[PDB]
Amino acid sequence: RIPRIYHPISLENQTQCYLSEDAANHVARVLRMTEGEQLELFDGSNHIYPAKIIESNKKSVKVEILGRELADKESHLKIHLGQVISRGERMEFTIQKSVELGVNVITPLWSERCGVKLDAERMDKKIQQWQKIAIAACEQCGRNIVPEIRPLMKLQDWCAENDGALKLNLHPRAHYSIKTLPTIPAGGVRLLIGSEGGLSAQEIAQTEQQGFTEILLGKRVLRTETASLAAISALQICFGDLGEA
Amino acid sequence: RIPRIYHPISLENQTQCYLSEDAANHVARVLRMTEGEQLELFDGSNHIYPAKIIESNKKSVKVEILGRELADKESHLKIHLGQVISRGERMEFTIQKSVELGVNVITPLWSERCGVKLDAERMDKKIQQWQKIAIAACEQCGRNIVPEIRPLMKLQDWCAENDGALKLNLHPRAHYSIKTLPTIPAGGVRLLIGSEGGLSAQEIAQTEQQGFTEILLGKRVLRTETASLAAISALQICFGDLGEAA
Numbered sequence: 001r002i003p004r005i006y007h008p009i010s011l012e013n014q015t016q017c018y019l020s021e022d023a024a025n026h027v028a029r030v031l032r033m034t035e036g037e038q039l040e041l042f043d044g045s046n047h048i049y050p051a052k053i054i055e056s057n058k059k060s061v062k063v064e065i066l067g068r069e070l071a072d073k074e075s076h077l078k079i080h081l082g083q084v085i086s087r088g089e090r091m092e093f094t095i096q097k098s099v100e101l102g103v104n105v106i107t108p109l110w111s112e113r114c115g116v117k118l119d120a121e122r123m124d125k126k127i128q129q130w131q132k133i134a135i136a137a138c139e140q141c142g143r144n145i146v147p148e149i150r151p152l153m154k155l156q157d158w159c160a161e162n163d164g165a166l167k168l169n170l171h172p173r174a175h176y177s178i179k180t181l182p183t184i185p186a187g188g189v190r191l192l193i194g195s196e197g198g199l200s201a202q203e204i205a206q207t208e209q210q211g212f213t214e215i216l217l218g219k220r221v222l223r224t225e226t227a228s229l230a231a232i233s234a235l236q237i238c239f240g241d242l243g244e245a
Numbered sequence: 246r247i248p249r250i251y252h253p254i255s256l257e258n259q260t261q262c263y264l265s266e267d268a269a270n271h272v273a274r275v276l277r278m279t280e281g282e283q284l285e286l287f288d289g290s291n292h293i294y295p296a297k298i299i300e301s302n303k304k305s306v307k308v309e310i311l312g313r314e315l316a317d318k319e320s321h322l323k324i325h326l327g328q329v330i331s332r333g334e335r336m337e338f339t340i341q342k343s344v345e346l347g348v349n350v351i352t353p354l355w356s357e358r359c360g361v362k363l364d365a366e367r368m369d370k371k372i373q374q375w376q377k378i379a380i381a382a383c384e385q386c387g388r389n390i391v392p393e394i395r396p397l398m399k400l401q402d403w404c405a406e407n408d409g410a411l412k413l414n415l416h417p418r419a420h421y422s423i424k425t426l427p428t429i430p431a432g433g434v435r436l437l438i439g440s441e442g443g444l445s446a447q448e449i450a451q452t453e454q455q456g457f458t459e460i461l462l463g464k465r466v467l468r469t470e471t472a473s474l475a476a477i478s479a480l481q482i483c484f485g486d487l488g489e490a491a
Contacts, residue, residue, distance in 0.1 A: 073464050093338075100471045102463070141465040179488030218347065218487045219318045220386040226345045226474075233478035234487060242463045242479055243422035 003031060004040045004048075004139045006146065011043040016054070016064050024061040027053070041065070042144045046072055073142045075102040077240035078188025079232060080165060082107050082158050084203075085123065086115045086195035089224045094193075095130045095149065099137035101232045102240060104147050104188070106134070111155040113200035123152045155192075155203055159210040163187045167212045169199065170227060174214035178234040181215070189235060193228040247285045247295075248276060249384040251391065256288045261299065261309050267377070269306040272298070284308060287389040291317055318387045320347035322485035323433025324477060325410060327403050329354040330361050331440035334469050340375045344382035344392055346477045347485060349433070351379075352395040354403050358442035368397050400437070400444065401451045410435040412457045415472060419459030423479040426460070434480060438473040 005027060008020045019027060019041075027033050035056045041049040041063070048071045055062040081103050083094060091108070098106060108127060110116060117123075130149045138146050159167065164187030168178075192212070194203065207214075217231060236242035250268045264272060264286075272278055280301055286294040286308070293316045300307035326348050328339055336353065343351060353372065355361065376394045383391050404412070410432030437457070444452070462476060481487035 075463070096468075097471050097474075100465055100467050101475060102465065141467065143465060175491040177488050177490035179482055180490040216489065216491055218320070218481065218485075218489075220345060220347060220388055222345050222386065223341075226342050229342075229471075229474055230346060230478040230481075230487065233475040234482045236463065237424055237479040237482055238488075242475070243424040243461060244464060245417060245419070245461050 002038060002040045002050075003027070003033070004042065004142070006135045006139055007041050007043045007049075009043060010045065011041060011049045011065055012045070012047075012068060014065050016062060018060055018062050021060065028056055028061050039063070042138075044144070044146045046070065046074065046144045048144055071144050074104075074145055075236055075241040077102070077184065077236065078104045078165070079235055079240075080105040080107065080163065080188065080190045081228065081232070082109050082155070082190060082192040083228065084109045084111055084114050084155060084193065084195040085152070086197070086224070089196045091126070091130065092133055093225050094228050095133045096137045097229050098232060099134045099143070099147055100141045101229065102143075102236055103232060105150065106130075106147055107150040107153050107158055109153055109155045109158055109192075111195070111200065111203050113197060113203070114195040115197065120152065127151060156206050159192070159206050159212065161190070163190060165190045167207070167210060168192070168215055169204075169207050169212045170194075170217055170231070171199075171204065171214040172216070174216045176213060176215045178215050178217065178231065179238055181213075181238075184239045191228075191231055191235070193224060193231065196224050198224075247283050248272075249285045249287065249387070251380045251384055252286050252288045254288065255290065256286060256294045256310055257290065257292075257313065259310050261307060264306045264308060269304070272306045273301050273303060286310070287316075287383075289389070289391040291315065291319065291389050293389055316389050319390055320481055320485040320487070322347070322429060322481060323410070324348045324480060324485075325350045325352070325433065325435045326473065326477070327352050327354055327400070327435060327437045328473060329356045329359050329400060329438065329440045330397075331442070331469065332360050333441055336371075336375060337378060339470055339473055340378050340394065341382045342474050343477060344379045344388070345386045346474065347388075347481055347487075348477060349392050350395065351375075351392060352403055353397050354400045355397055356400045356440060356442060357445045357448065359440045360442055372396060400439070400448055404437065404451050404455045404457070406435070408432045408435075412452075412455055413437065413460055414452055414457045415462055415476065416459035417461070419461045421458055422461045423476070423483050426458075426483070429484050436473075436476055436480070438469060438476070440469055
């Protein structure tokens with residue numbers, strides 16, 4: 001029942017500290033919590049810091065940490081989501097559910113055929129909101145590590161990254177199934193999910209050169225948001241922690 | 246490709262027909278297709294009927310049925326979703342994704358602490374809309390069997406239904422996981438997903454009476470919507486068509 005609140009900086013070796021401005025407003029003017037009340041803070045280091053409000057002011061809220069405890073709610077499987085941005089794909093939905101499902105990293109991608117705009121500061125503002133969505137997702141589901149929403153990247157450049165992870169992408173011609181995958185490297189997995197429309201003919205061209213491994217995911221055509229959530233769920237149940245308490 | 250269109254009645258052994266009002270409007274007004282255009286119809290029999298428009302106008306679309314062929318895009322696992330309604334959730338999203346993911350039947354449920362009223366005429370209208378969403382999802386994902394969205398039921402009554410299906414519910418202290426289930430009965434699976442309000446003592450006792458099998462779903466607490474879709478995906482992966490190779 002105790003509300004979880006994220007803290008922008010390290011809470012280690014901290015005593016009395018001001019909650020971030022935004023978090024302060026939520027705790028006091030949204031949850032309507034007052035001095036003396038407790039909360040569960042976390043600074044993204046996989047540790048929770050039980051604390052209590054000491055100063056509830058209109059300008060901000062100060063708190064006093066009561067200690068530090070390790071609470072690993074992370075999956076042993078690493079998943080890096082590479083999502084192509086579009087228009088009507090509900091990126092917020094994807095960000096939120098992906099975080100709840102244990103995703104470790106999310107890189108918003110852009111390609112020739114998708115359906116978006118062009119300004120960097122334009123998506124840059126959206127990415128900030130997506131990071132906040134991730135933070136709130138961790139506050140809700142219990143994760144004490146907040147996955148980063150990297151800056152806009154080019155599908156070509158993303159596919160060219162080297163992390164020691166198994167690169168995967170969906171395709172109906174594929175013969176491999178997430179359930180029939182032979183192994184998972186130490187770098188985990190890099191899952192690419194196309195935009196609303198889907199992976200263009202050129203996008204599937206770059207994945208082939210980068211040595212991507214195509215997989216099947218049912219006999220039905222899934223929408224973007226459904227495909228990402230389903231694929232992540234499948235990965236977590238087959239090689240992750242979706243089967244643990 | 247060729248647009249898919251659902252027809253409200255059996256097209257078996259039919260030579261020509263008029264598309265439904267919604268389909269006609271979509272074909273004539275949205276896609277604005279002329280005569281001679283190909284369409285791929287389906288009537289929920291698991292079959293597709295390639296057809297051609299023979300008359301298209303502002304308020305009427307007539308088509309000629311050219312054939313009938315089996316097109317099974319169904320999972321070999323039957324999933325019956327028992328979804329409790331609420332105020333802090335979107336049933337619309339759940340319906341669409343569940344259908345795409347192969348769910349076979351969905352029963353919307355009322356729970357003592359679900360935080361929702363009981364307007365019959367209102368709920369009936371909501372169900373009609375959810376049913377249309379299910380039809381649209383089938384047109385989109387390729388399914389040729391349309392899942393039924395059943396009338397509202399109380400959670401206790403729904404849990405009491407018996408059709409030989411394995412009854413499953415989510416619990417953090419479950420001594421089972423989808424990946425560890427021994428088998429699937431002939432009735433398939435009946436998956437219960439409650440709201441953020443949880444269940445009353447009398448409801449959890451009813452699940453116990455009905456022999457509901459608890460299952461784990463990870464170390465993180467999921468929102469209602471996330472839990473239903475993640476549970477569905479896991480079931481289809483372990484016992485359905487999502488985990489089938491080629």
